[PDB]
Amino acid sequence: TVINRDGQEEKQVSFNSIYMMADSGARGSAAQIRQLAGMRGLMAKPDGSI
Amino acid sequence: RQMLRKATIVNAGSSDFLEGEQVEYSRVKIANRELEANGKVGATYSRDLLGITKASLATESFISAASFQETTRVLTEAAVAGKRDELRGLKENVIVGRLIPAGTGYAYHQDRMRRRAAG
Amino acid sequence: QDLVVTEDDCGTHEGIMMTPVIEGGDVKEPLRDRVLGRVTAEDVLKPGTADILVPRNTLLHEQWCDLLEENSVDAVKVRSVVSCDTDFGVCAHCYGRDLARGHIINKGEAIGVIAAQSIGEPGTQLTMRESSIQVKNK
Amino acid sequence: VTEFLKPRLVDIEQVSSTHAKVTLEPLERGFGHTLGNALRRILLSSMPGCAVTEVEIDGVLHEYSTKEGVQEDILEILLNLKGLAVRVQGKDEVILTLNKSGIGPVTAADITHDGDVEIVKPQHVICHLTDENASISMRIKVQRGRGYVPASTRIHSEEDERPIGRLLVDACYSPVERIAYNVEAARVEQRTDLDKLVIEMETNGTIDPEEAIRRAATILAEQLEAFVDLRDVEFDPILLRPVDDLELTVRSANCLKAEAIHYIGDLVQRTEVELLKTPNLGKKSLTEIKDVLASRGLSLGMRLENWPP
Amino acid sequence: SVTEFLKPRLVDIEQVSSTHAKVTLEPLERGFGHTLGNALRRILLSSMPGCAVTEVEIDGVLHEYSTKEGVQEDILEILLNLKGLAVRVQGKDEVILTLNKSGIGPVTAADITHDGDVEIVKPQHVICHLTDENASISMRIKVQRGRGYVPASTRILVDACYSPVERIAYNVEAARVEQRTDLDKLVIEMETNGTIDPEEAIRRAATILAEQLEAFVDLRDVR
Amino acid sequence: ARVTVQDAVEKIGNRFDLVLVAARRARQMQVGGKDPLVPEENDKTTVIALREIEEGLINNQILDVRERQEQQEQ
Amino acid sequence: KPLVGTGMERAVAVDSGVTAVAKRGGVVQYVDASRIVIKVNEDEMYPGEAGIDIYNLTKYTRSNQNTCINQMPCVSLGEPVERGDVLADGPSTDLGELAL
Amino acid sequence: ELPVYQGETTQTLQDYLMWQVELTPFTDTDRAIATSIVDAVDDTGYLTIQIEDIVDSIGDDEIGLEEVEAVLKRIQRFDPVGVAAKDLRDCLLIQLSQFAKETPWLEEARLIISDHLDLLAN
Amino acid sequence: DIVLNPLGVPSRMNIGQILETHLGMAAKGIGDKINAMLKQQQEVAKLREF
Amino acid sequence: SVITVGPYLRLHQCGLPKKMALELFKPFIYGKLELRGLATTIKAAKKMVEREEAVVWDILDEVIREHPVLLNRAPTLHRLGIQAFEPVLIEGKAIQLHPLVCAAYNADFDGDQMAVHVPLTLEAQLEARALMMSTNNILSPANGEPIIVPSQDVVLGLYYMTRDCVNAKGEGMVLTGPKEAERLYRSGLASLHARVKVRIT
Amino acid sequence: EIKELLKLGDLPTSGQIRLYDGRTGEQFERPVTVGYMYMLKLNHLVDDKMHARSTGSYSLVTQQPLGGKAQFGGQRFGEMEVWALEAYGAAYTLQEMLTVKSDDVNGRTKMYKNIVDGNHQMEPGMPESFNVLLKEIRSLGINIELED
C-alpha cells in the first residue's frame, strides 16, 4: 500500500480489513484467505485418491 | 500410574502365590514384614503393564463397577464372592449420597476415620 | 476417578529425567515448560563443579526457571507421581501445581478428575486419519 | 467567554408540507456539530404528537375477522389508520365518527367534521368497498403521547375490562419521522470566521418546524438546569391494633399491663417455653390466649425485623 | 403531562482529590445521558477560557535544537514542563515573566517573579533541571488568553493549552425508578490541573452551554 | 463485596478448609447470638463472615477458643 | 417480496398450492375478503352451465405448526384474469412470488 | 418409555392442608394434634368425626378438650377458609369473620347465622 | 435497521450475502429514484424512458 | 434459558430475567415476606406472589443481591463448564453472559441455551464464591495460560488502535502522556501517528 | 454489472459511504458498506424455550421430577456436570444437589421449611432411588442388607 509522501519510499504495512483480521488473529487465516482471492487448491477427496 | 498396578511376584515371602496382588499391597506387606520381624520375607516383584480398561476390572468396589461395565455379571461375581465394598470409592458415596472424601469433604472423611477407633 | 490427595510428603528422592526433546530439524519443546510446574530433584548441578542452585524442596516460580535459562542447564531430574508414592493418594511436592492457581496443590483436590479430563477435553483432533544428513547451524 | 455570540434564528424555509429546510444562524467554532447532535437526538426521542389511539367498529368483533362488503381485511384497516396524521386542539382525547356507503374507496376526507380535528393529508385511502349495499361505520379516539407505546403496554390502562367489540392499536407519537443536519461555512466574512448548520427535516405534517425546534431547545435548556448548580454535597405491618378487643377474661389484661406488653405484635414474637417463665398464669390461661390469638395472633408465631414507633 | 420530564435528584459528588472528581446522576430520561455527556465533553474541552504559555524566547539559537550548557536536560523536556504550568491572570490579556535563578538547586515554579495579576497554584512545580556548578539562564516567557487548545503548527514553540481540564470521560449505566428499567444514568469523571474547582468547572460549562440557547427559544414553554 | 477471595485464602492457605471455617461462623451469625465484629454494609451473613475472616480476625483457632470460653462460662 | 431473487419464486409459490390459482376464468364481477366470483367468457365454458366460478379464501385457520394462514385478493374490481394466473396470496406470498 | 408410564404425583386437598402445617410454627405436641385433625378431614371439607372424639382417640386423658380447639381454631383459617368445619354451620361463622367489617350488613348476617338458621331453613 | 458482525465473512466464506447486499442497495437506489420521479409529478414519457 | 451476550456486565456478574428470578427464588421471597411482616401467613405470601405486587420486586431485588447462581452449558467436557456468577435484574427472556467467559463455555450464541442452578445452604454459596467464580478460573487447568483472553472484536480493536500509516495527522509533535487522549476526541491529532514523543512514567 | 447499476442509481461504485455515530455525531473513518438484505425469522423464539420451576409434582418411581415443559420438570443433570463439580471439591454442593432436590421426600421438605424459616440447614437422609434399586435387586436371588 503506497501513500502520498515527498520521498514515496514507504513500503508500510497495508490496512486491509481482512488482512488486519488475519494478522491480528481475531478471525481467519492465510489458508482461508487464499480461497477468496487466489485458487482454493486441489480440494478433492471423493475417496482415498486425488 | 492408574494403569501401572496389578503386578506379579515370584517369591512366596510368607505370602501365597497370588500372581496379581496390587502394587500398593505388594509394597505395604514388605513395609510391615521386613524391618519388623525379618527382611528375608521380602519377595521380588515385576510391575506388569495392564490395559487402561482392564485395570478398571480390578476395581474391588463392585458398587463403583456396575456403573462402569456390565452389571449382572459383576453382581454375580460379588455374590459368589460374598464380598463387601465398605464404601471406599467416591462414586460409591455418591450413590449413597453423603459427602465425597475429596475436596471440602476430604477433612470430613478424615474425621470419619478418626471416629473409627477413638470416636 | 478414585484418586484423592491424602498425603503431604512424598518421602523418596527418586524421579525421572526431564530434557528438552529434539527432532533434528528443530526443537519441538524447550526446557522451560516441561519443568515449569515441577519440583527439582535432590540436587541440581551447574556447569561449574561444586555448585548447587536449588534444594530438593523448592518450587519453581519461573524465577529459578529464568535463572536456569541463563545458565544453559540440560540435565535436570524431576520428581514424578508414577515413580514416587505412599501406596495411597498422591504426594504434594511430587506433583507440583500446574493449575489455575499460583500456590502449591492442597490436600483434597481431585487430581484424578482434572487429569483424564484435560486429556479428553480436546475431542476435536481428527477422524479416520534421505541418504545425506544436513545441519541447521554450527 | 470573550464574545460568545448567540444564534438568532432567521430565514426559515418550507419547501413542501412534509419536508423542511430550516436553517439556524451564526455560531462559534465547534458549537455547530455538538448543537446539531444534541438537537437531533431530542427532536426524535421526545416530541409530543397526536396519533390514532383507539378504533371501534360496530359490525366487527375482533381483529382476526373479516366484514362482508369490503376488500381489505379488518387487520389491514388498523395498519392503515396507524399512520394517520392529525393535529388536535387544546383539548385532549378527541373522538370522531366515520360512516360511508357506496363502492368508492373510503378516504380521510369523508370524516365527520369537528372543530378541534384537522386532517392534513386526506388523499390516502382507509379501505375499499365492492358492494352498493355495503356500508361502514366506526369511531376513532385520538390522543397525544410523547413516544411509541405498544398495545401490550397500554392494555393495562383499563381499570378491569373492555366491552366486546373494542380493539387497540399501536401508538407512535413521533410525528417528525426524519431529521438530519449539515454544517458549512458562514455567509459573512467581515467578522471572525464562523459556521452555519442547517437542520433538514421531514415530518408527518402535524407539528410546525419552528415550534418543534423551540420545543426541542426548551427541553434541552430546562434539562441543563441541574448541571448549572450542583447541590446536595411506609413499610409497616397491617396488624397494629392495641391489646383491646382480645377479650382478656380475668388476668390476661393484668399480665399484659404488668409485663409492659405492646399492642399486638410483641406477644406474637414469643415462645411458649419462655411464656412459662412469666409470673403465674396457668396452662388454662395459656390455652385461652392461644385460642384467642388463633384468629388474630396466628398461633403466636412470627419473627419481626424491627418495631417503628 | 406530555411536556413534563424527569429531573435528576441524586446529584451527590464523590470526588477523591482536589483535581479528580466523579459526579453521578441516577435519574434521567431514556436516550438523554449520552446526549448531555457528549455535549458537556465537547463544550468544556473545545471552548473554555484559560491561560497558558504561548511562546518562549530563551538565550541561544533561535531553532528548537540546542545544547544543554551544563543544564544536562534536553531542550525538548524544558518546553514540555512549561506546557503543564498552571498560570492565572486576574484582569490582563497578555503578560510577560522574566527570571534567572542561580545554578545551585532544582528550579521550582516559585522562582517566577510575583506580579499583580500573575498567580500560580503550585509553586513547587518542576521547570528546569539542576545545573553543574554555575550554569544559569533567563526565562523570558509570556502568556496570553484563549479558548480550547491551539497546536504549534497553526499558531506559535510551546503549545498553548487554554483548556484547564486535563481529562474528561462519561459513562452510561442502566437504572429504574419504581417500575420501568433501562433509564440511562450518567457518571462523569474529570481531572483538572488546578486553579479551577471541578464542580465549578461543570457549573461554568453548563452556564456556557445554556447561555448560547436562550435566544433560540425566546422564553417559550418556560415554567 | 468479597468479589475475589484471595485474602482469606492467604490467611488459611488450604483453599478447602476456608469454606468449612466460614460455614459455621455464617451459620452462627444467621441463627443469632453473635454480633459481627466488622461493620456490616447491608450484605449477607456469608459475605460478612468471609470479610471478617479475610481481616485476620476469625479463623479455625479463635472460634474454638470462643466456644470453649462460652462453655466454661455456662 | 425479495429485492433480489432467482425467478423460481413464482413457480414455487404456484406449485405450492397454498395460494388461489385461477382456472377457466374470465371477467371478475365481485371480490371480498373471503369470497371471489369470476364470470367466464362465452367461448370458454361448455353449454348447460351458468358460467360462474366461486373461490372461498382461507381466513385464520389453525395450521399443523401452531401458526396462521390467510389469503387476500390481489384484484380490486373489473379486472380480467387469464387461465393459470393467481388470484389470492397465502402466507408468506406477495403477488404470486414467494416472500418469506 | 419404562415401567412407570410417566408417573405423576397429584397434590390434593389433604396434601395441600399438610403442606401448610409444616410452614406454620407449632410445637411438637401441637403438631401431632394437627396431624390427627387433618386425617379426619373429608372430600367434602368437614372434620368427619367430632371434637371430643379426637380427644378420646388420642388416648391421653391429659390433653384438654380446648387444646384441640386451640389448634383446630387455627387450622380452619388455612387455604380454603372454612375447611374442617364443625357440622355445616361453623363454616359460615369462620368464613364471615374473615373479610373486613366494612361490609354493609355484617352485624345482621352474623346475628342470623348465630341462632337463626332453623328459621332460614324454611 | 439491522447490524451484523463483520468478523463472520472472513472465516465463514459468504461473499454471496455481501453481493446480495450490494445488489439490494442498488435496487433500493433505483426504487428511491422512481419514487422521487413519481412524487415530483413528472410526465409518463420520462418515467417510461427511465 | 436462552443465553445471550452482554457488554455492560462484569466478569463476576450475570443477567437473569425478572420472571425467572421470581419462580426460582420463591421460598426466599416467602421467608422475606414472613420476616418483614408484609405477609402474616404463608397463604398471604403465595397470594401476593401470584398477584405480583410492587413491593414483591423490591424484596426480590433485596434478596437476590448477594445470592450466587451457577450457570453452565449443556455440553461440558472440562472443569470450566460450570461457573458461578451474581444475578442482575434485567428485563426480557434471555440470560446475559459475559463475553470473556465464552471461550471457557465454547459458545457463539447461535441458538444454544444455558442451564442455571441456585445454591441453598451457606456452604454451597461459599463453595460457589471461593471456588466456582470466573474471577478464580482465569487460567486453564490444562495449561496454566490465561483462558480469559478477549474475543475477535477486542483483539481487532486493540490492533487497529495502535497503528500508523505514514505521517498521519498529529505526527512529529511532542506532548505529555495520558494527555494524548484529549487530542483524539477534539480532532487535534489522529490515534495513528508515528514519531510522537510522550512522557511515560 | 453491479457497479454499473450502482452508478446508474446515483450510488457509489464500491458500495461504501460515510456514516455518523448516533451517540457522538462523529464521522466514521474507513467507510463501511451499506445496503439492504433479505432477512428471515425462524421458529426459535424465547416464548417457549424459557422455563422456570422451584417445586411441583414428582414421579411415582424414585420420586424424581419430569423432563418436559408441561407439568414442570427438571432438566437432565448428566454425568459431565457432576464430574466437573468433583474437580472443584464442592462436596456439600453436590450433596444438596443430589439429595435434597430430587430424592429424600422428607429431606427436601425439611430444606423447604428451613429456607422459609431462614435456618439454611440440610440433611443427607437417604435417596429414594437407592431404595428402589435395593427393592428391585432383592426380587431376584440376591441378598443385600444394611448392616451396622
Swiss-Prot record, chain B:
Q: How is it used?
A: Co-administration of salinamide and rifampicin or salinamide and myxopyronin suppresses the emergence of resistance to both antibiotics.
Please describe the post-translational modifications of this protein: Acetylated on several lysine residues in the presence of glucose.
**Description of how the protein assembles with itself and partners:** The RNAP catalytic core consists of 2 alpha, 1 beta, 1 beta' and 1 omega subunit. When a sigma factor is associated with the core the holoenzyme is formed, which can initiate transcription. The rRNA transcription and antitermination complex (rrnTAC) consists of RNAP, NusA, NusB, NusE (rpsJ), NusG, SubB, ribosomal protein S4, DNA and precursor rRNA; S4 is more flexible than other subunits.
Q: Describe the family membership recorded for this protein in Swiss-Prot or TrEMBL.
A: Belongs to the RNA polymerase beta' chain family.
Tell me the function of this protein: DNA-dependent RNA polymerase (RNAP) catalyzes the transcription of DNA into RNA using the four ribonucleoside triphosphates as substrates.
Its protein name is DNA-directed RNA polymerase subunit beta'
- In the complete protein, the residues contained here run 1258 to 1376 of 1407
Curated annotation (Swiss-Prot), chain D:
Residue ranges, annotated region (Alpha N-terminal domain (alpha-NTD)): 1-231
The organism's lineage is: Bacteria, Pseudomonadati, Pseudomonadota, Gammaproteobacteria, Enterobacterales
Q: What reaction(s) does this enzyme catalyze?
A: RNA(n) + a ribonucleoside 5'-triphosphate = RNA(n+1) + diphosphate
Source superkingdom: Bacteria
Q: Which GO terms describe its molecular function?
A: DNA binding; DNA-directed RNA polymerase activity; protein dimerization activity
Q: Which HAMAP family match?
A: RNApol_bact_RpoA (MF_00059)
Similarity comment: Belongs to the RNA polymerase alpha chain family.
Gene Ontology CC: cytoplasm; cytosol; cytosolic DNA-directed RNA polymerase complex; membrane; transcription elongation factor complex
Q: Which NCBIfam families match?
A: PRK05182.1-2 (NF003513), PRK05182.2-5 (NF003519), rpoA (TIGR02027)
Domain commentary: The N-terminal domain is essential for RNAP assembly and basal transcription, whereas the C-terminal domain is involved in interaction with transcriptional regulators (such as CRP) and with upstream promoter elements.
The UniProt entry's GO biological process terms, in alphabetical order, are: bacterial-type flagellum assembly; bacterial-type flagellum-dependent cell motility; cell motility; cellular response to cell envelope stress; DNA-templated transcription initiation; intracellular iron ion homeostasis; nitrate assimilation; regulation of DNA-templated transcription elongation
Supply the SUPFAM superfamilies for this chain: C-terminal domain of RNA polymerase alpha subunit (SSF47789), Insert subdomain of RNA polymerase alpha subunit (SSF56553), RBP11-like subunits of RNA polymerase (SSF55257)
Name of protein: DNA-directed RNA polymerase subunit alpha
The region called Required for interaction with Crp at class II promoters is annotated at 158-161
Q: Quick one: where's region Alpha C-terminal domain (alpha-CTD)?
A: 235-309
Curated annotation (Swiss-Prot), chain F:
A molecular function GO annotation: bacterial-type RNA polymerase core enzyme binding
Listed under GO biological process in this entry are: bacterial-type flagellum assembly; bacterial-type flagellum-dependent cell motility; cell motility; cellular response to cell envelope stress; DNA-templated transcription initiation; intracellular iron ion homeostasis; nitrate assimilation; protein-containing complex assembly
Q: Which reaction does it catalyse?
A: RNA(n) + a ribonucleoside 5'-triphosphate = RNA(n+1) + diphosphate
This enzyme's EC code(s): 2.7.7.6
The domain of life for this entry's organism is Bacteria
Asked if Transcription is a keyword of the record, the answer is: yes
Keyword line: DNA-directed RNA polymerase, Nucleotidyltransferase, Transcription, Transferase
Q: Give the record's GO CC terms.
A: cytosol; cytosolic DNA-directed RNA polymerase complex; RNA polymerase complex; transcription elongation factor complex
| Quaternary structure and interacting proteins, as annotated | The RNAP catalytic core consists of 2 alpha, 1 beta, 1 beta' and 1 omega subunit. When a sigma factor is associated with the core the holoenzyme is formed, which can initiate transcription. The rRNA transcription and antitermination complex (rrnTAC) consists of RNAP, NusA, NusB, NusE (rpsJ), NusG, SubB, ribosomal protein S4, DNA and precursor rRNA; S4 is more flexible than other subunits.
Which family would the database say this protein is a member of? Belongs to the RNA polymerase subunit omega family.
Briefly, what is this protein's role?
Promotes RNA polymerase (RNAP) assembly. Latches the N- and C-terminal regions of the beta' subunit thereby facilitating its interaction with the beta and alpha subunits.
Q: Native species of this protein?
A: Escherichia coli (strain K12)
From Swiss-Prot, chain K:
**Modification comment:** Acetylated on several lysine residues in the presence of glucose.
UniProt biotechnology annotation: Co-administration of salinamide and rifampicin or salinamide and myxopyronin suppresses the emergence of resistance to both antibiotics.
Q: According to the UniProt entry, which residues carry N6-acetyllysine?
A: 7
| Subunit architecture | The RNAP catalytic core consists of 2 alpha, 1 beta, 1 beta' and 1 omega subunit. When a sigma factor is associated with the core the holoenzyme is formed, which can initiate transcription. The rRNA transcription and antitermination complex (rrnTAC) consists of RNAP, NusA, NusB, NusE (rpsJ), NusG, SubB, ribosomal protein S4, DNA and precursor rRNA; S4 is more flexible than other subunits. In pull-down experiments interacts with CedA. (Microbial infection) Interacts (via flap domain) with Escherichia phage lambda antitermination protein Q; this interaction renders bacterial RNAP resistant to transcription pausing and allows it to read through termination signals.
Write out the function statement from the record: DNA-dependent RNA polymerase (RNAP) catalyzes the transcription of DNA into RNA using the four ribonucleoside triphosphates as substrates.
The text of the family note is: Belongs to the RNA polymerase beta chain family.
Q: What is the protein's given name?
A: DNA-directed RNA polymerase subunit beta
Source lineage: Bacteria, Pseudomonadati, Pseudomonadota, Gammaproteobacteria, Enterobacterales
Q: Which gene encodes it?
A: rpoB
